[model samples]
Target: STGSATTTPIDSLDDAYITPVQIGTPAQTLNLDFDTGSSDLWVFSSETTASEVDGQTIYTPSKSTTAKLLSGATWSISYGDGSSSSGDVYTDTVSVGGLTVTGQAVESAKKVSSSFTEDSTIDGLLGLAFSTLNTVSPTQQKTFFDNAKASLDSPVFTADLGYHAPGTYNFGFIDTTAYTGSITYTAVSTKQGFWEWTSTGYAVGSGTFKSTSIDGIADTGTTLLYLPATVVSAYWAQVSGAKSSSSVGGYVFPCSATLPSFTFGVGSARIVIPGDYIDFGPISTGSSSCFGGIQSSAGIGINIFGDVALKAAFVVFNGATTPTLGFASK
Candidate 1:
């Protein structure tokens, strides 16, 4: 059963633009992506010039009567999609969901690419996936979680994604009723921000691909699941009449047939990729054909499990405790 909790939308005081909530208090707004692939809280600042950003919210300290700007330190970030932004760092009174947290670290991008500047709907990204994949490190820099960990009542944080609606990403509590049993936590590797895992095998339409193994990292910032070329081709071969279309960018097949049930294993955990997700959309060349979820990334070293794979399970990030990941049922 689903329940409702009090949610507050973080908005730009000047334009009334509502931003996504990741963490922070209700009085001070902190816009974040609530990403499950990484753990970090970053925001744009007034110094970030208007020309540098696209498709993102730019923070204007001048607009907010209460906004504060910090001096000296600088910060910049580049995404896997080839987008990047840079700015200065500052501390401010941040709020979320009616809770107020002070002295939250924020970034004010001085220069942002067109990808971030153009998108009005997306302000900044909040990474809440796992500490193991965090961009900021204690040796390099202190992140929002590293600073806020002491303030939380509980070390565990959970994100309740609301599908098409604004999701709820909460810190400090686990809300155990959200799961079927005690949450299963996976030990994290102390690398950087990428949580790499090896899959035991894959199951397509009840048929198991026993000889092959798949390895990839779970990324919340990505929307599509990128598979290796060989794996994608093999999976498509199993689908009746499935063909590769150059116009489709990957694999495409008719949606009329009863699609096979696809499942894959991560260590001992089994994950199912629904058939509906398989048919992404229509291909430009063939009107009868539709694009599939599996895309070809032949030379890419890593496979990314995007939102399609993430929505299936309840994920928890425990940065306050030991670097750990918790998987549960919604």
Candidate 2:
């Protein structure tokens, strides 16, 4: 059956999008971040140490008649931001919107890094990446989509990340009314366990688009746009008083700086990130310096079109054939 869910910004435009997912018997509703960059459906649970758990909701298998422990199994996951989670596994009924999957493996976190513990709003991460990226050891687990794909009318989902607004995540069925203009299709290579696609070129400033191929993933979990250092440098150069500092760990410019728009071409389609959107808010609570929304992905191997860039377009992640991605103006 076709399914759909709403992803709303947690508290700001650049933070994260949280959606509801029902887990276990009788449906334990948890608000989770639908992450496209990783593959592991993990949640804060009773297994988590009390000291490590803060205000977040915890999943208790004992409360669910359908929950069953997956013996001799565990999961560990780490993110580029240094945030991580690890724990044992349980199989339970999990559903997103109206889509349901029985006996879905659910990782129950016993430990979580500071980034996750502090963000009490994020109960778990719903991984949309390929099953190969799952961190479960001994026996790999399948994602909810993978388990339900055969029953779906189509193997695809559309991500519509909004600009300070609520967005829609459509599964199996594409809603034509959500996007404007014709969608440009890009051939995706998934050997890396990600929805990796290459762009024909990128433009740092309002200038003409430069002809430089860029490879990156459409990441909804990542908050900012991460490009190669050179491209990031080009973007900052256009803004005066912009400089990098270890304190901020990224490029920071004057709060009053007016930035030029950043554009990139995906196949035949062109996507643009407005200037104002690239200025993420102020760097510090009382400081006028603002952190740049575009940063260097020097160590990450490939560029990352995170929320900053993905929100600029309507994206379709199709698991159909060679795994194609479709993009259109929002």
Candidate 3:
């Protein structure tokens, strides 16, 4: 079986993409952020304290006949940015696009951080990373993708994130027509439960491609491209007005400054990010200073190729026993 769904950005900066998901027997639909960086399919639920619920849809297990509590199960997750949530677990019928998975673990959030409650754009997250990263305790559960892979024609899924536009998430089969030229494949290291791979090299704009390898994760959950400090500095140095600001927490420059493109190699295939995409939105509302989409990973410990980079290519997340990632220019 194969399935596909549209992922629409909720903000101007493509802060996050939301895809509709069906939960329970009655099929209550909720918009969820599909995250490849984590492995927990959690949601705002009836169990969520009223104080933590704000403008987001809540999943009511009592209304679903198939909902079953996972006895003694509890899950907690926190991100590098401090956004977090913790909750109980329930297994229920869950569907995305046309694919259905019975008894899929649907975490019910009892507590959530301010960032989650304040951002009404997403009701929950559908984790696509390996199930080994699942936070469920006393008997870890599998992710929606992990459970649905067996029934799928191919144990794989693809992510095509767009810039301020609607993109796609396809399961079971790859859409050859979605990309141009040939795909470059790379082995993935799931030891960290992320779609982590190593890039052969990178180039600042049309400059020479550096013949160096950089290990990083292709994370749809992250908002920007975070590379090593030297690499990030090299890109920003090319921008005439760019300046690193401690007050702003990153490199920022005049919104009117021209930006050079960034290229990264996946084997021999080089994916290029247009300069406009790097001109991430303003520092504040109507501010003239803009933040760069490419930032330093010095503080992060791990490099992340986030939405800014994902939007530039067609990515395949092969869920084979020995997983691999395929990248192609779109």
Candidate 4:
């Protein structure tokens, strides 16, 4: 009985990526990132070593009336980008969107590298992805969804990415104001961990794209789209007036031109990405203006439709049902 979800990728500039949430009351409000990758919601704490913690924001537990430590267990996480953070575990009342959850287990990294510390605008991350990839065991864990489900008007949550500006990452509800028609739903796939899908083929602009009919997986953790090298070369060929510059990684093109719209067929569902997204960043040395969709992963085996693809449609991860991925539109 599950259906699909869809959302249009738009530009967002609001510092909405770092949301203000409650841990217990107004006295313990903390800013957290709305991440769809890993499922463990963690925060930086005062116990973190000053030498190890550089630019990242560290929360002061003394400011909260209901903060507790998780003994002396040390915690560490390494991302695909080779960035890592290590800290001790602790529990505290965490809140978001005016909703409060008590005894939330968070990691207080004792040591953090420049990559994580320098990019640390928010205090922590609230992972909105599925529970399968959670760092915390299901037996001793509670997600933001678990705590806010009762307060949500709908059992679903939707994410809308704003343009260059920071997009709006919403929970407890789905916004349908931007859609032009009825929503479409796709059956869920019972794949383990991430939201895996069967990608029939890919097309760029209006050209006849190579029918690779590859099996694709949608990952929120990745920022770029990773595809086979052949597919990427083929896509760049059709992008009129678009040239791949050496700067922005792979292909780089100008935004002023009419870049072709690309679509990926998920079963009978087709998700489309606008030309603008294809022309991602501006052109500069080591920075191509061309959109960075579909790149070579050096034989990583798994092809991932990262944020570039997810931003174009609403995606749902339904672990409760068989064929666990639900796709729809907003």
What shift in Å separates residue 116 of candidate 1 from its native position after superposition? 2.1
Q: Give the Cα-based TM-score of candidate 3 against the true structure.
A: 0.99
Clashes of 4: 47
Ranking by lDDT: 3, 2, 4, 1
- 1-330 in candidate 4: lDDT tens per residue? 111122222223122245665553335555676666556676766876676555555677767667776775555666556776666666777655445556777666567666656655656666665666556432444567655555555555555554454445455454566443444554534355555666767887776545557666666656667777777777767655655455555665555556667777766666787766555555444543445555665466677777777667766544343534444444
- Write the residue-wise lDDT of candidate 1 on 87-165 in tens digits: 6665665555433456665666677777666655556765544444444322233444555567677665565443324
- Which model, 3 or 4, shows the larger lDDT? 3
Off by over 4 Å in 1: 1-19, 22-31, 38-40, 51-57, 63-68, 98-100, 129-140, 162-166, 209-213, 241-248, 255-259, 283-289
Model 4 regions more than 4 Å off: 1-16, 24-27, 51-56, 136-140, 146-154, 187-191, 208-213, 240-249, 253-258, 282-291, 319-323, 328-330
lDDT of 2 by residue, 1-330 (tens): 988999899986458999999998888999999988998999999999898888888899999999999999999999978889999999999989799999999999999998899998999999998999999988999988888888888998889988888898888888889888889999888989998999888886668788888999988889999998988898899999999988889999999889888998988679989998897778778889988999999987878989999889989998885788999997
Highest lDDT: which candidate?
Answer: 3
For candidate 4, the per-residue lDDT at 96 reads: 54
lDDT of 3: 0.94
Q: What is the C-alpha lDDT of each candidate?
A: 0.57, 0.89, 0.94, 0.59
Task: Please report the candidate that would top TM-score against the real structure.
Answer: 3
Poorest lDDT segment (10 consecutive residues) of candidate 4: 1-10
Q: Please state the error at residue 156 of candidate 1 in Å.
A: 2.2
Better of 1 and 4 by TM-score: 4
Give candidate 3 misplaced runs (Cα > 4 Å). Answer: none
